[PDB]
Design an enzyme around this catalytic site. Sequence first.
Site, PDB file in Angstrom:
ATOM      1  N   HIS A   1      28.405 -85.723  25.728  1.00  0.00           N
ATOM      2  CA  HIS A   1      29.503 -86.447  25.825  1.00  0.00           C
ATOM      3  C   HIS A   1      28.132 -86.171  27.793  1.00  0.00           C
ATOM      4  O   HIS A   1      28.441 -87.614  27.662  1.00  0.00           O
ATOM      5  CB  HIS A   1      30.522 -86.538  26.395  1.00  0.00           C
ATOM      6  CG  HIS A   1      31.526 -87.675  27.314  1.00  0.00           C
ATOM      7  ND1 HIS A   1      32.025 -88.309  26.457  1.00  0.00           N
ATOM      8  CD2 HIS A   1      31.126 -87.410  28.441  1.00  0.00           C
ATOM      9  CE1 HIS A   1      32.195 -89.514  27.444  1.00  0.00           C
ATOM     10  NE2 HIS A   1      32.257 -88.690  28.576  1.00  0.00           N
TER      11      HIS A   1
ATOM     12  N   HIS B   1      25.965 -88.827  29.903  1.00  0.00           N
ATOM     13  CA  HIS B   1      26.041 -89.205  31.528  1.00  0.00           C
ATOM     14  C   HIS B   1      25.112 -89.419  32.172  1.00  0.00           C
ATOM     15  O   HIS B   1      24.244 -90.890  32.870  1.00  0.00           O
ATOM     16  CB  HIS B   1      26.979 -88.620  32.255  1.00  0.00           C
ATOM     17  CG  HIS B   1      28.839 -89.562  31.613  1.00  0.00           C
ATOM     18  ND1 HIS B   1      28.636 -90.502  31.613  1.00  0.00           N
ATOM     19  CD2 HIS B   1      30.161 -89.070  31.525  1.00  0.00           C
ATOM     20  CE1 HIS B   1      30.065 -91.799  30.922  1.00  0.00           C
ATOM     21  NE2 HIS B   1      30.432 -90.177  30.959  1.00  0.00           N
TER      22      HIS B   1
HETATM   23 ZN   LIG Z   1      32.082 -89.182  30.502  1.00  0.00          ZN
END
Ligand SMILES: [Zn+2]
EC number: 3.4.24.27
Lengths: 316, 316
Positions: free
Chosen positions: A142, A146
Amino acid sequence: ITGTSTVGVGRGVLGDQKNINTTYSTYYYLQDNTRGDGIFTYDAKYRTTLPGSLWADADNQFFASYDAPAVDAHYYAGVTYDYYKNVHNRLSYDGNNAAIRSSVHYSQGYNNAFWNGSEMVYGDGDGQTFIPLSGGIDVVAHELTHAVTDYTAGLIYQNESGAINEAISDIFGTLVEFYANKNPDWEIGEDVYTPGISGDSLRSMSDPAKYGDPDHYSKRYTGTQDNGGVHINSGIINKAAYLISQGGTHYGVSVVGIGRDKLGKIFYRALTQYLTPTSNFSQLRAAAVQSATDLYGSTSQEVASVKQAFDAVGVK
Amino acid sequence: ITGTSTVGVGRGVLGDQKNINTTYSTYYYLQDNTRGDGIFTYDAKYRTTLPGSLWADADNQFFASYDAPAVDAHYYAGVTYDYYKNVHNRLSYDGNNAAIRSSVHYSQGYNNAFWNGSEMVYGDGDGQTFIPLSGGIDVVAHELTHAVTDYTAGLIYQNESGAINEAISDIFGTLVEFYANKNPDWEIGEDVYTPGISGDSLRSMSDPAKYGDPDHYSKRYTGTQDNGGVHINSGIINKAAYLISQGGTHYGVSVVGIGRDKLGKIFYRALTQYLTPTSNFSQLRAAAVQSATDLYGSTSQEVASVKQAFDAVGVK
Ligand SMILES: [Zn+2]
Ligand SMILES: [Ca+2]
Ligand SMILES: [Ca+2]
Ligand SMILES: [Ca+2]
Ligand SMILES: [Ca+2]
Ligand SMILES: [Ca+2]
Ligand SMILES: [Ca+2]
Ligand SMILES: [Ca+2]
Ligand SMILES: [Ca+2]
Ligand SMILES: [Zn+2]
């Protein structure tokens, strides 16, 4: 460091034993020279100064309990690099084999982990709410997603674009968790969240409302907290992506699932070719439809399922 | 970069003209070789990837409106380095002349600025709530003081230790604003906050309750927002520090002021010699009393004023 590439062995946060790529030069360092310009893991030694010291070990065996978070940060950055390379032909987060750096043992009792714009940072948790956050492969993927988003669409971190940014990270975190076949599911953070409670997680993509997050555009959060709801309103897109993949009926609307692989190709294309820094949910829907059209044809079942899923969560 | 040290001229965010230290090597870069291992300012070009590109300019004159935030980040990092060196004998934030790096134009419409553990980051503001945040010398010095705190006490960023960490940054930000004699006051962020409203600021040290922050320990915030109130509960310590400096009567208790200079010596000593990562408000009071004792004697007026100030804000 300059040294000889070798392989060491250790135990991760959950007690599992794994091999990790290291570098020898007097000490053995957590430096993996087999992927891109390298994967480097540092010890922040309970301070907040970054990145800390490159992790050095005397005998290439990482079974101490202080080592655990480092073994998993180092190993799960490798798995995530492999997913993006093998599945999407993307070399590291900038597409040019940038080195991936992570620091573990950041601060004391810190219940979070994040990509700061230049590297990954992981807290050890307080031991009640979380255990060391690099033990969750979906958390690692996750956060590294980004970095991908920052180099491509550049989605700003607030209001609907921030919610898309968070959802894209949940989606790809979950696809990496399925790629590594690590007890996969559609929940986020379940391996490291609340060690004392079984069955829960930080968020759910299959049923966001389980934890109180919205699963429909009409229930979106409109205030100012959480940078305008970036972690809350991502539930709307997470549910759409779960429906595209898995299918289901939601508020009246039936969606035929097309599977995880196509879900990943559609969103990856949408993220790298059509989203921009200020994209909102309606422009995500247009980007996903256009991507599915590029890949499968305007009269495919894939295009039809993307439309039904966004219609099911109320995004037009 | 390697090049020749020179001096360029530009205009800051508020329109004031200033000289800045630059380096020439084909282009002129914002690289100041006269302080420590250097002060380096980068262009993040509206993205969130850091640090961005070292700021390069063709003619050593920085009067474009895109240049303004860079001129002030670069110049006000120099002033802050000079304050710590000249007043407290501290060479840069680690005490060993570490290079100071800042990136400006971070993201789009970003209403904040922060020390991320390795460097300073400044948004341009949205133009309504804020203008480019490096135009506020107290904001720049507030953030660079988190770097000092990280290398010394290591105060964790939550609950009472985080509130102390924020207050220490407000105190020293304000002392640097008085050192540079830039229209000084005890308010924080007034030069860059809400361009359309005169007279307000983000926070007030002389009267924290102006903006709703607590000015007494009995009014502290006890919930979970803001990492347990680090920006809110810092009002209690800010008011104590304003009283130590300036004197006054507050909830019944009279404090004789001892001035800004001694305020700065007491808190700097407390921060570098007695505070630890988990210090709470009561241990700040003990540390400040011990510091004033070390410096001025246990029966000085300085020790008496530190005790009265903490008694006035209800911290025992
Ligand atoms: Zn995040
Ligand atoms: Ca070992
Ligand atoms: Ca799982
Ligand atoms: Ca999961
Ligand atoms: Ca649990
Ligand atoms: Ca110029
Ligand atoms: Ca002022
Ligand atoms: Ca001020
Ligand atoms: Ca104003
Ligand atoms: Zn601060």
